[PDB]
Design a binder for this molecule. Sequence first.
Ligand SMILES: CCCCCCCC(=O)O
Ligand SMILES: CCCCCCCC(=O)O
Ligand SMILES: [Mn+2]
Ligand SMILES: [Mn+2]
Ligand SMILES: [Mn+2]
Ligand SMILES: [Mn+2]
Ligand SMILES: [Mn+2]
Ligand SMILES: [Mn+2]
Lengths: 274, 274
Amino acid sequence: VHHDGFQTVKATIDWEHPMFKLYEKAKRNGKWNPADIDFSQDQKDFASLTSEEKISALPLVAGFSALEEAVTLDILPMAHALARQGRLEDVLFLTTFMHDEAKHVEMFSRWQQAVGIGQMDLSVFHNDHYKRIFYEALPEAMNRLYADDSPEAVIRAATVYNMIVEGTLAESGYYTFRQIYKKAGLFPGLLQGIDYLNMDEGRHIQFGIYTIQRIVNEDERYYELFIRYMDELWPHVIGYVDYLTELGKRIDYDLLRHYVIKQFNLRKKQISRT
Amino acid sequence: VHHDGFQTVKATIDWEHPMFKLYEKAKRNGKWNPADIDFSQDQKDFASLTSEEKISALPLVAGFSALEEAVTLDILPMAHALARQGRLEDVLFLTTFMHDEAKHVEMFSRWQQAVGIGQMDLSVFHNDHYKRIFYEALPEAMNRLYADDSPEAVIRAATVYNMIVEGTLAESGYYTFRQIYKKAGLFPGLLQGIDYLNMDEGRHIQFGIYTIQRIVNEDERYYELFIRYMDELWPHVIGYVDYLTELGKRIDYDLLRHYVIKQFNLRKKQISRT
Ligand SMILES: CCCCCCCC(=O)O
Ligand SMILES: CCCCCCCC(=O)O
Ligand SMILES: [Mn+2]
Ligand SMILES: [Mn+2]
Ligand SMILES: [Mn+2]
Ligand SMILES: [Mn+2]
Ligand SMILES: [Mn+2]
Ligand SMILES: [Mn+2]
Protein backbone atom coordinates (compact mmCIF):
# COMPACT_ATOMS: atom_id res chain seq x y z
CA VAL A 1 0.00 0.00 0.00
CA HIS A 2 0.97 3.58 -0.67
CA HIS A 3 3.47 5.80 1.09
CA ASP A 4 1.72 8.77 2.73
CA GLY A 5 4.96 10.74 2.60
CA PHE A 6 8.51 10.35 3.83
CA GLN A 7 9.95 11.21 7.22
CA THR A 8 13.27 12.44 5.82
CA VAL A 9 11.40 14.76 3.44
CA LYS A 10 8.96 16.19 5.96
CA ALA A 11 11.58 16.25 8.72
CA THR A 12 14.70 14.16 9.53
CA ILE A 13 15.76 10.93 11.16
CA ASP A 14 15.09 10.99 14.91
CA TRP A 15 18.78 11.24 15.82
CA GLU A 16 18.15 10.51 19.50
CA HIS A 17 16.05 7.37 18.98
CA PRO A 18 17.53 4.38 20.85
CA MET A 19 17.48 2.26 17.69
CA PHE A 20 19.22 4.99 15.72
CA LYS A 21 21.91 4.97 18.36
CA LEU A 22 22.09 1.17 18.14
CA TYR A 23 22.31 1.42 14.35
CA GLU A 24 25.27 3.76 14.68
CA LYS A 25 26.97 1.36 17.09
CA ALA A 26 26.35 -1.54 14.70
CA LYS A 27 28.09 0.27 11.82
CA ARG A 28 31.10 1.13 13.99
CA ASN A 29 31.37 -2.39 15.43
CA GLY A 30 30.12 -4.38 12.42
CA LYS A 31 33.14 -4.49 10.14
CA TRP A 32 34.28 -8.10 10.55
CA ASN A 33 34.17 -10.35 7.49
CA PRO A 34 33.92 -14.17 7.75
CA ALA A 35 35.83 -14.35 4.47
CA ASP A 36 38.93 -13.05 6.27
CA ILE A 37 39.04 -15.80 8.92
CA ASP A 38 41.90 -18.28 8.53
CA PHE A 39 40.41 -21.79 8.87
CA SER A 40 43.58 -23.66 7.82
CA GLN A 41 44.37 -24.78 11.37
CA ASP A 42 40.74 -25.77 11.93
CA GLN A 43 41.06 -28.07 8.90
CA LYS A 44 44.14 -29.75 10.36
CA ASP A 45 42.55 -29.99 13.82
CA PHE A 46 39.43 -31.64 12.47
CA ALA A 47 41.42 -34.11 10.33
CA SER A 48 43.62 -35.13 13.27
CA LEU A 49 40.52 -36.05 15.28
CA THR A 50 39.33 -39.64 15.45
CA SER A 51 35.97 -40.49 13.90
CA GLU A 52 34.32 -40.56 17.35
CA GLU A 53 35.92 -37.24 18.30
CA LYS A 54 34.81 -35.76 14.96
CA ILE A 55 31.19 -36.71 15.63
CA SER A 56 31.23 -35.04 19.05
CA ALA A 57 31.47 -31.57 17.50
CA LEU A 58 28.77 -31.96 14.88
CA PRO A 59 25.46 -31.78 16.85
CA LEU A 60 26.21 -28.30 18.13
CA VAL A 61 27.39 -27.12 14.70
CA ALA A 62 24.21 -28.54 13.17
CA GLY A 63 22.18 -26.59 15.70
CA PHE A 64 24.01 -23.36 15.01
CA SER A 65 23.97 -23.48 11.21
CA ALA A 66 20.18 -23.94 11.23
CA LEU A 67 19.73 -21.30 13.93
CA GLU A 68 21.62 -18.70 11.93
CA GLU A 69 19.91 -19.55 8.65
CA ALA A 70 16.47 -19.44 10.32
CA VAL A 71 17.04 -16.08 12.00
CA THR A 72 18.42 -14.63 8.75
CA LEU A 73 15.19 -15.48 6.96
CA ASP A 74 12.77 -14.96 9.80
CA ILE A 75 13.68 -11.38 10.80
CA LEU A 76 12.16 -10.07 7.57
CA PRO A 77 8.52 -9.99 8.84
CA MET A 78 9.62 -7.95 11.87
CA ALA A 79 11.34 -5.44 9.62
CA HIS A 80 8.20 -5.27 7.46
CA ALA A 81 5.87 -4.81 10.42
CA LEU A 82 7.93 -1.99 11.94
CA ALA A 83 8.41 -0.33 8.53
CA ARG A 84 4.63 -0.35 8.03
CA GLN A 85 4.24 1.25 11.45
CA GLY A 86 6.55 4.07 10.31
CA ARG A 87 9.34 3.15 12.76
CA LEU A 88 12.14 4.26 10.43
CA GLU A 89 14.94 4.12 12.98
CA ASP A 90 14.05 0.54 13.96
CA VAL A 91 14.18 -0.36 10.25
CA LEU A 92 17.60 1.25 9.78
CA PHE A 93 18.91 -0.73 12.74
CA LEU A 94 17.33 -3.95 11.48
CA THR A 95 19.30 -3.69 8.21
CA THR A 96 22.43 -4.20 10.36
CA PHE A 97 20.71 -7.02 12.30
CA MET A 98 19.83 -8.84 9.05
CA HIS A 99 23.29 -8.40 7.59
CA ASP A 100 24.90 -9.62 10.83
CA GLU A 101 22.84 -12.83 10.57
CA ALA A 102 23.95 -13.31 6.95
CA LYS A 103 27.57 -13.19 8.12
CA HIS A 104 26.76 -15.67 10.90
CA VAL A 105 25.27 -18.15 8.41
CA GLU A 106 28.26 -17.58 6.17
CA MET A 107 30.76 -18.14 9.00
CA PHE A 108 29.46 -21.58 10.00
CA SER A 109 29.06 -22.71 6.39
CA ARG A 110 32.66 -21.65 5.60
CA TRP A 111 33.84 -23.65 8.60
CA GLN A 112 31.93 -26.77 7.48
CA GLN A 113 33.37 -26.39 4.00
CA ALA A 114 36.91 -25.87 5.24
CA VAL A 115 36.98 -28.85 7.61
CA GLY A 116 35.48 -31.22 5.04
CA ILE A 117 31.90 -31.81 6.25
CA GLY A 118 29.97 -29.51 3.89
CA GLN A 119 28.77 -32.59 1.99
CA MET A 120 27.40 -34.22 5.17
CA ASP A 121 23.70 -33.79 5.93
CA LEU A 122 23.75 -32.70 9.58
CA SER A 123 19.91 -32.63 9.84
CA VAL A 124 20.08 -35.91 11.76
CA PHE A 125 21.07 -33.93 14.88
CA HIS A 126 17.78 -31.95 14.97
CA ASN A 127 15.47 -33.79 17.36
CA ASP A 128 11.72 -33.17 17.71
CA HIS A 129 12.21 -30.37 20.29
CA TYR A 130 14.68 -28.58 18.03
CA LYS A 131 12.27 -28.80 15.12
CA ARG A 132 9.38 -27.50 17.20
CA ILE A 133 11.36 -24.32 17.88
CA PHE A 134 13.28 -23.72 14.67
CA TYR A 135 11.28 -25.41 11.93
CA GLU A 136 7.87 -24.37 13.34
CA ALA A 137 7.35 -21.96 16.26
CA LEU A 138 9.93 -19.38 15.14
CA PRO A 139 8.69 -18.94 11.53
CA GLU A 140 5.06 -19.14 12.72
CA ALA A 141 5.50 -16.32 15.20
CA MET A 142 7.40 -14.09 12.78
CA ASN A 143 5.22 -14.66 9.72
CA ARG A 144 2.15 -13.85 11.79
CA LEU A 145 3.31 -10.23 11.67
CA TYR A 146 2.40 -9.94 7.96
CA ALA A 147 -1.31 -10.14 8.89
CA ASP A 148 -1.33 -9.26 12.60
CA ASP A 149 1.02 -6.61 13.98
CA SER A 150 -0.89 -6.20 17.24
CA PRO A 151 1.19 -5.60 20.40
CA GLU A 152 0.47 -9.20 21.43
CA ALA A 153 1.84 -10.43 18.13
CA VAL A 154 4.96 -8.26 18.27
CA ILE A 155 5.72 -9.25 21.86
CA ARG A 156 5.36 -12.93 20.97
CA ALA A 157 7.62 -12.60 17.93
CA ALA A 158 10.35 -10.77 19.88
CA THR A 159 10.04 -13.27 22.76
CA VAL A 160 10.50 -16.33 20.54
CA TYR A 161 13.18 -14.78 18.32
CA ASN A 162 15.23 -12.49 20.56
CA MET A 163 14.67 -13.84 24.08
CA ILE A 164 14.47 -17.63 23.46
CA VAL A 165 16.24 -18.43 20.19
CA GLU A 166 19.01 -15.81 20.51
CA GLY A 167 18.96 -14.85 24.19
CA THR A 168 18.65 -18.34 25.67
CA LEU A 169 19.74 -21.00 23.17
CA ALA A 170 22.32 -19.15 21.07
CA GLU A 171 23.87 -17.42 24.07
CA SER A 172 24.24 -20.76 25.88
CA GLY A 173 25.52 -22.30 22.68
CA TYR A 174 28.37 -19.77 22.35
CA TYR A 175 29.35 -20.29 25.93
CA THR A 176 29.35 -24.07 25.62
CA PHE A 177 31.51 -24.05 22.52
CA ARG A 178 34.09 -21.87 24.32
CA GLN A 179 33.90 -23.96 27.49
CA ILE A 180 34.96 -26.93 25.34
CA TYR A 181 37.22 -26.05 22.42
CA LYS A 182 39.06 -22.98 23.72
CA LYS A 183 40.22 -25.21 26.58
CA ALA A 184 41.23 -28.00 24.17
CA GLY A 185 43.16 -25.53 22.00
CA LEU A 186 41.10 -26.53 18.93
CA PHE A 187 39.32 -24.71 16.07
CA PRO A 188 40.86 -21.22 16.52
CA GLY A 189 39.18 -19.91 13.35
CA LEU A 190 35.74 -21.04 14.50
CA LEU A 191 36.28 -19.56 17.95
CA GLN A 192 37.28 -16.22 16.42
CA GLY A 193 34.07 -16.34 14.41
CA ILE A 194 32.08 -17.11 17.56
CA ASP A 195 33.71 -14.12 19.30
CA TYR A 196 32.59 -11.78 16.54
CA LEU A 197 29.14 -13.36 16.44
CA ASN A 198 28.70 -12.92 20.19
CA MET A 199 29.61 -9.24 19.88
CA ASP A 200 26.98 -8.77 17.19
CA GLU A 201 24.35 -10.61 19.21
CA GLY A 202 24.74 -8.18 22.11
CA ARG A 203 23.13 -5.57 19.88
CA HIS A 204 20.42 -7.93 18.67
CA ILE A 205 19.23 -8.69 22.18
CA GLN A 206 19.01 -4.97 22.96
CA PHE A 207 16.56 -4.61 20.09
CA GLY A 208 14.45 -7.43 21.49
CA ILE A 209 14.45 -5.85 24.95
CA TYR A 210 13.60 -2.40 23.55
CA THR A 211 10.72 -3.81 21.53
CA ILE A 212 9.20 -5.86 24.33
CA GLN A 213 9.64 -3.14 26.94
CA ARG A 214 8.05 -0.38 24.87
CA ILE A 215 4.97 -2.56 24.41
CA VAL A 216 4.92 -3.53 28.11
CA ASN A 217 5.23 0.18 28.91
CA GLU A 218 1.88 0.79 27.24
CA ASP A 219 0.01 -1.86 29.25
CA GLU A 220 1.42 -3.75 32.23
CA ARG A 221 -0.72 -6.75 31.29
CA TYR A 222 1.64 -7.47 28.40
CA TYR A 223 4.26 -8.40 31.00
CA GLU A 224 2.22 -11.48 31.91
CA LEU A 225 2.03 -12.39 28.22
CA PHE A 226 5.82 -12.11 27.87
CA ILE A 227 6.42 -14.44 30.83
CA ARG A 228 3.83 -16.90 29.50
CA TYR A 229 5.41 -17.03 26.04
CA MET A 230 8.82 -17.66 27.66
CA ASP A 231 7.47 -20.53 29.77
CA GLU A 232 5.64 -22.07 26.78
CA LEU A 233 8.93 -22.66 24.95
CA TRP A 234 10.98 -23.84 27.95
CA PRO A 235 10.06 -27.54 27.53
CA HIS A 236 11.47 -27.51 24.02
CA VAL A 237 14.56 -25.58 25.08
CA ILE A 238 15.35 -28.03 27.85
CA GLY A 239 14.23 -30.95 25.73
CA TYR A 240 16.85 -30.04 23.13
CA VAL A 241 19.47 -29.64 25.87
CA ASP A 242 18.52 -33.06 27.28
CA TYR A 243 18.98 -34.53 23.80
CA LEU A 244 22.39 -32.87 23.28
CA THR A 245 23.41 -33.89 26.81
CA GLU A 246 22.45 -37.50 26.06
CA LEU A 247 24.29 -37.50 22.72
CA GLY A 248 27.52 -36.19 24.23
CA LYS A 249 27.38 -38.55 27.20
CA ARG A 250 27.29 -41.32 24.58
CA ILE A 251 32.62 -31.32 30.00
CA ASP A 252 30.36 -30.38 32.90
CA TYR A 253 26.81 -30.79 31.59
CA ASP A 254 25.37 -29.85 34.99
CA LEU A 255 27.20 -26.52 34.50
CA LEU A 256 26.02 -26.04 30.91
CA ARG A 257 22.47 -27.05 31.80
CA HIS A 258 22.49 -24.42 34.53
CA TYR A 259 23.86 -21.81 32.13
CA VAL A 260 20.75 -22.35 29.98
CA ILE A 261 18.48 -22.10 33.01
CA LYS A 262 20.47 -19.04 34.04
CA GLN A 263 20.14 -17.29 30.68
CA PHE A 264 16.41 -18.01 30.48
CA ASN A 265 15.91 -16.45 33.90
CA LEU A 266 18.02 -13.36 33.26
CA ARG A 267 16.20 -12.63 30.00
CA LYS A 268 13.02 -12.45 32.06
CA LYS A 269 14.65 -9.98 34.45
CA GLN A 270 15.63 -7.61 31.64
CA ILE A 271 11.92 -6.82 31.20
CA SER A 272 10.28 -4.65 33.85
CA ARG A 273 6.61 -5.02 34.74
CA THR A 274 6.62 -1.30 35.52
CA VAL B 1 5.06 -21.34 7.22
CA HIS B 2 7.54 -23.96 8.32
CA HIS B 3 11.14 -24.48 7.31
CA ASP B 4 11.57 -27.82 5.50
CA GLY B 5 15.24 -27.87 6.49
CA PHE B 6 18.26 -25.65 6.07
CA GLN B 7 20.66 -25.44 3.15
CA THR B 8 23.73 -24.88 5.33
CA VAL B 9 22.83 -27.98 7.37
CA LYS B 10 22.09 -30.29 4.46
CA ALA B 11 24.91 -28.83 2.37
CA THR B 12 26.62 -25.40 2.15
CA ILE B 13 26.23 -21.99 0.61
CA ASP B 14 26.55 -22.14 -3.19
CA TRP B 15 29.95 -20.42 -3.23
CA GLU B 16 29.87 -19.88 -7.00
CA HIS B 17 26.41 -18.30 -7.16
CA PRO B 18 26.54 -14.86 -8.83
CA MET B 19 24.71 -13.26 -5.90
CA PHE B 20 27.10 -14.84 -3.42
CA LYS B 21 29.92 -13.28 -5.38
CA LEU B 22 28.08 -9.94 -5.37
CA TYR B 23 27.53 -10.29 -1.61
CA GLU B 24 31.26 -10.77 -1.13
CA LYS B 25 31.99 -7.69 -3.23
CA ALA B 26 29.46 -5.66 -1.24
CA LYS B 27 31.18 -6.51 2.07
CA ARG B 28 34.61 -5.58 0.69
CA ASN B 29 33.36 -2.33 -0.87
CA GLY B 30 30.63 -1.45 1.66
CA LYS B 31 32.57 0.04 4.55
CA TRP B 32 31.76 3.75 4.17
CA ASN B 33 29.84 5.43 6.98
CA PRO B 34 27.74 8.60 6.43
CA ALA B 35 28.50 9.52 10.04
CA ASP B 36 32.14 10.10 9.07
CA ILE B 37 31.42 12.68 6.35
CA ASP B 38 32.45 16.24 7.21
CA PHE B 39 29.50 18.51 6.33
CA SER B 40 30.94 21.67 7.95
CA GLN B 41 31.82 23.26 4.60
CA ASP B 42 28.43 22.29 3.18
CA GLN B 43 26.84 24.23 6.05
CA LYS B 44 28.87 27.34 5.22
CA ASP B 45 28.20 26.95 1.48
CA PHE B 46 24.47 26.69 1.99
CA ALA B 47 24.38 29.69 4.37
CA SER B 48 26.35 31.87 1.94
CA LEU B 49 23.76 31.20 -0.77
CA THR B 50 20.98 33.68 -1.43
CA SER B 51 17.41 32.61 -0.74
CA GLU B 52 16.78 32.05 -4.46
CA GLU B 53 20.02 30.07 -4.82
CA LYS B 54 19.09 28.02 -1.73
CA ILE B 55 15.76 27.04 -3.25
CA SER B 56 17.41 25.83 -6.46
CA ALA B 57 19.04 22.88 -4.69
CA LEU B 58 16.00 21.68 -2.77
CA PRO B 59 13.79 19.96 -5.42
CA LEU B 60 16.48 17.44 -6.28
CA VAL B 61 17.28 16.81 -2.60
CA ALA B 62 13.57 16.31 -1.92
CA GLY B 63 13.45 13.77 -4.71
CA PHE B 64 16.46 11.88 -3.43
CA SER B 65 15.51 11.72 0.25
CA ALA B 66 12.13 10.19 -0.65
CA LEU B 67 13.71 7.87 -3.22
CA GLU B 68 16.16 6.47 -0.68
CA GLU B 69 13.57 6.13 2.07
CA ALA B 70 11.15 4.38 -0.32
CA VAL B 71 13.71 1.90 -1.61
CA THR B 72 14.86 1.15 1.95
CA LEU B 73 11.34 0.12 2.91
CA ASP B 74 10.24 -1.38 -0.37
CA ILE B 75 13.04 -3.92 -0.92
CA LEU B 76 11.72 -6.02 1.97
CA PRO B 77 9.03 -7.87 -0.08
CA MET B 78 11.66 -8.87 -2.65
CA ALA B 79 13.87 -10.29 0.08
CA HIS B 80 10.86 -12.17 1.49
CA ALA B 81 9.82 -13.57 -1.89
CA LEU B 82 13.32 -14.85 -2.73
CA ALA B 83 13.79 -16.24 0.80
CA ARG B 84 10.53 -18.18 0.43
CA GLN B 85 11.79 -19.54 -2.88
CA GLY B 86 14.89 -20.85 -1.08
CA ARG B 87 17.29 -18.49 -2.88
CA LEU B 88 19.65 -18.15 0.08
CA GLU B 89 22.49 -16.45 -1.77
CA ASP B 90 20.14 -13.77 -3.16
CA VAL B 91 18.95 -13.16 0.42
CA LEU B 92 22.50 -12.83 1.75
CA PHE B 93 23.25 -10.27 -0.95
CA LEU B 94 20.02 -8.39 -0.29
CA THR B 95 21.04 -7.82 3.35
CA THR B 96 23.87 -5.65 1.94
CA PHE B 97 21.44 -3.99 -0.51
CA MET B 98 19.06 -3.08 2.33
CA HIS B 99 21.82 -1.79 4.56
CA ASP B 100 23.26 0.29 1.70
CA GLU B 101 19.86 1.98 1.28
CA ALA B 102 19.72 2.73 5.02
CA LYS B 103 23.05 4.54 4.70
CA HIS B 104 21.74 6.42 1.66
CA VAL B 105 18.68 7.65 3.59
CA GLU B 106 20.95 8.54 6.48
CA MET B 107 23.38 10.47 4.26
CA PHE B 108 20.76 12.83 2.78
CA SER B 109 19.05 13.36 6.13
CA ARG B 110 22.40 14.24 7.78
CA TRP B 111 23.03 16.74 5.00
CA GLN B 112 19.61 18.37 5.46
CA GLN B 113 20.21 18.56 9.19
CA ALA B 114 23.69 20.00 8.81
CA VAL B 115 22.76 22.74 6.34
CA GLY B 116 19.73 23.85 8.35
CA ILE B 117 16.73 22.60 6.33
CA GLY B 118 15.77 19.50 8.33
CA GLN B 119 12.77 21.41 9.72
CA MET B 120 11.52 22.32 6.22
CA ASP B 121 8.84 20.11 4.67
CA LEU B 122 10.26 19.42 1.20
CA SER B 123 7.17 17.42 0.09
CA VAL B 124 6.06 20.44 -1.94
CA PHE B 125 8.60 19.45 -4.63
CA HIS B 126 6.90 16.08 -5.34
CA ASN B 127 4.58 16.63 -8.30
CA ASP B 128 1.87 14.20 -9.44
CA HIS B 129 4.28 12.22 -11.66
CA TYR B 130 6.74 11.79 -8.79
CA LYS B 131 3.97 10.57 -6.52
CA ARG B 132 2.70 8.11 -9.11
CA ILE B 133 6.12 6.44 -9.13
CA PHE B 134 7.30 6.70 -5.54
CA TYR B 135 4.16 6.96 -3.44
CA GLU B 136 2.18 4.41 -5.51
CA ALA B 137 3.62 2.27 -8.31
CA LEU B 138 6.83 1.30 -6.48
CA PRO B 139 5.21 0.06 -3.22
CA GLU B 140 2.37 -1.54 -5.20
CA ALA B 141 4.73 -3.58 -7.34
CA MET B 142 6.89 -4.68 -4.42
CA ASN B 143 4.10 -5.50 -1.97
CA ARG B 144 2.43 -7.62 -4.63
CA LEU B 145 5.22 -10.15 -4.02
CA TYR B 146 3.78 -11.10 -0.60
CA ALA B 147 0.80 -12.76 -2.35
CA ASP B 148 2.06 -13.28 -5.91
CA ASP B 149 5.68 -14.27 -6.55
CA SER B 150 5.04 -15.39 -10.13
CA PRO B 151 7.78 -14.65 -12.70
CA GLU B 152 5.59 -11.87 -14.09
CA ALA B 153 5.35 -10.32 -10.64
CA VAL B 154 9.08 -10.58 -9.94
CA ILE B 155 10.02 -9.12 -13.33
CA ARG B 156 7.64 -6.20 -12.77
CA ALA B 157 9.00 -5.52 -9.28
CA ALA B 158 12.63 -5.57 -10.45
CA THR B 159 11.75 -3.41 -13.48
CA VAL B 160 10.07 -0.69 -11.41
CA TYR B 161 12.59 -0.79 -8.55
CA ASN B 162 15.96 -1.57 -10.13
CA MET B 163 15.60 -0.48 -13.75
CA ILE B 164 13.36 2.63 -13.43
CA VAL B 165 13.69 4.02 -9.90
CA GLU B 166 17.40 3.20 -9.43
CA GLY B 167 18.68 2.59 -12.96
CA THR B 168 16.97 5.51 -14.69
CA LEU B 169 15.96 8.20 -12.18
CA ALA B 170 18.57 7.79 -9.44
CA GLU B 171 21.41 7.28 -11.89
CA SER B 172 20.42 10.45 -13.79
CA GLY B 173 19.98 12.23 -10.48
CA TYR B 174 23.56 11.49 -9.36
CA TYR B 175 24.92 12.65 -12.65
CA THR B 176 22.93 15.88 -12.59
CA PHE B 177 24.03 16.77 -9.09
CA ARG B 178 27.69 16.33 -10.12
CA GLN B 179 27.17 18.22 -13.38
CA ILE B 180 26.06 21.18 -11.24
CA TYR B 181 27.73 21.39 -7.83
CA LYS B 182 31.11 19.78 -8.48
CA LYS B 183 31.58 22.46 -11.14
CA ALA B 184 30.45 25.21 -8.75
CA GLY B 185 32.82 23.95 -6.05
CA LEU B 186 29.92 23.56 -3.59
CA PHE B 187 28.73 20.91 -1.10
CA PRO B 188 31.88 18.73 -0.98
CA GLY B 189 30.44 16.56 1.81
CA LEU B 190 27.27 15.84 -0.15
CA LEU B 191 29.25 15.07 -3.29
CA GLN B 192 31.44 12.61 -1.36
CA GLY B 193 28.26 10.95 -0.15
CA ILE B 194 26.93 10.79 -3.70
CA ASP B 195 30.19 9.17 -4.84
CA TYR B 196 29.83 6.41 -2.26
CA LEU B 197 26.14 6.00 -3.04
CA ASN B 198 26.85 5.64 -6.76
CA MET B 199 29.40 2.93 -6.02
CA ASP B 200 26.86 1.01 -3.97
CA GLU B 201 24.19 1.38 -6.64
CA GLY B 202 26.40 -0.32 -9.22
CA ARG B 203 25.90 -3.52 -7.25
CA HIS B 204 22.17 -2.95 -6.83
CA ILE B 205 21.59 -2.69 -10.56
CA GLN B 206 23.48 -5.95 -11.14
CA PHE B 207 20.98 -7.69 -8.88
CA GLY B 208 18.11 -6.25 -10.88
CA ILE B 209 19.69 -7.39 -14.15
CA TYR B 210 20.43 -10.88 -12.77
CA THR B 211 16.86 -11.25 -11.53
CA ILE B 212 15.18 -10.09 -14.73
CA GLN B 213 17.52 -12.05 -17.00
CA ARG B 214 17.15 -15.36 -15.18
CA ILE B 215 13.37 -15.09 -15.55
CA VAL B 216 13.67 -14.05 -19.22
CA ASN B 217 16.00 -17.01 -19.70
CA GLU B 218 13.15 -19.36 -18.79
CA ASP B 219 10.71 -17.91 -21.34
CA GLU B 220 11.58 -15.38 -24.03
CA ARG B 221 8.06 -13.96 -23.78
CA TYR B 222 9.00 -12.32 -20.49
CA TYR B 223 11.29 -10.02 -22.49
CA GLU B 224 8.23 -8.36 -24.02
CA LEU B 225 6.78 -7.91 -20.54
CA PHE B 226 9.99 -6.24 -19.32
CA ILE B 227 9.97 -3.75 -22.22
CA ARG B 228 6.26 -3.04 -21.66
CA TYR B 229 6.73 -2.34 -17.95
CA MET B 230 9.60 0.04 -18.79
CA ASP B 231 7.50 1.95 -21.33
CA GLU B 232 4.51 2.15 -18.93
CA LEU B 233 6.53 4.21 -16.44
CA TRP B 234 8.31 6.46 -18.97
CA PRO B 235 5.56 9.14 -19.01
CA HIS B 236 5.96 9.62 -15.28
CA VAL B 237 9.75 9.60 -15.49
CA ILE B 238 9.78 12.28 -18.16
CA GLY B 239 6.89 14.08 -16.53
CA TYR B 240 8.94 14.47 -13.35
CA VAL B 241 11.94 15.64 -15.41
CA ASP B 242 9.72 18.17 -17.21
CA TYR B 243 8.57 19.46 -13.81
CA LEU B 244 12.13 19.73 -12.44
CA THR B 245 13.25 21.35 -15.70
CA GLU B 246 10.45 23.91 -15.42
CA LEU B 247 11.22 24.64 -11.75
CA GLY B 248 14.91 25.25 -12.41
CA LYS B 249 14.26 27.40 -15.48
CA ARG B 250 12.18 29.56 -13.13
CA ILE B 251 22.92 24.04 -16.57
CA ASP B 252 22.18 22.27 -19.84
CA TYR B 253 18.73 20.73 -19.39
CA ASP B 254 18.78 19.40 -22.96
CA LEU B 255 21.89 17.45 -21.86
CA LEU B 256 20.35 16.20 -18.61
CA ARG B 257 17.08 15.32 -20.33
CA HIS B 258 19.05 13.24 -22.82
CA TYR B 259 20.98 11.55 -20.02
CA VAL B 260 17.64 10.29 -18.66
CA ILE B 261 16.57 9.11 -22.10
CA LYS B 262 20.01 7.57 -22.46
CA GLN B 263 19.87 5.68 -19.16
CA PHE B 264 16.36 4.39 -19.85
CA ASN B 265 17.51 3.00 -23.19
CA LEU B 266 20.70 1.39 -21.90
CA ARG B 267 18.82 -0.36 -19.09
CA LYS B 268 16.74 -2.01 -21.79
CA LYS B 269 19.89 -3.15 -23.60
CA GLN B 270 21.28 -4.86 -20.50
CA ILE B 271 18.50 -7.46 -20.85
CA SER B 272 18.84 -9.99 -23.67
CA ARG B 273 15.81 -11.49 -25.38
CA THR B 274 17.89 -14.63 -25.91
C1 LIG C 1 24.92 -27.92 27.07
C2 LIG C 1 24.01 -27.58 25.90
C3 LIG C 1 23.58 -26.13 26.04
C4 LIG C 1 23.94 -25.32 24.79
C5 LIG C 1 22.71 -24.87 23.97
C6 LIG C 1 23.10 -25.02 22.49
C7 LIG C 1 22.22 -24.15 21.58
C8 LIG C 1 22.52 -24.48 20.11
O1 LIG C 1 23.21 -25.49 19.81
O2 LIG C 1 22.04 -23.76 19.17
C1 LIG D 1 17.61 17.01 -15.24
C2 LIG D 1 16.76 16.19 -14.29
C3 LIG D 1 17.18 14.73 -14.42
C4 LIG D 1 17.60 14.14 -13.08
C5 LIG D 1 16.64 13.08 -12.53
C6 LIG D 1 16.54 13.31 -11.01
C7 LIG D 1 16.05 12.07 -10.27
C8 LIG D 1 15.80 12.40 -8.79
O1 LIG D 1 15.78 13.60 -8.41
O2 LIG D 1 15.56 11.49 -7.94
MN1 LIG E 1 23.26 -14.76 14.70
MN1 LIG F 1 20.98 -12.38 16.23
MN1 LIG G 1 11.11 -35.14 24.55
MN1 LIG H 1 20.15 4.10 -2.76
MN1 LIG I 1 19.82 0.99 -4.62
MN1 LIG J 1 1.89 16.01 -16.35
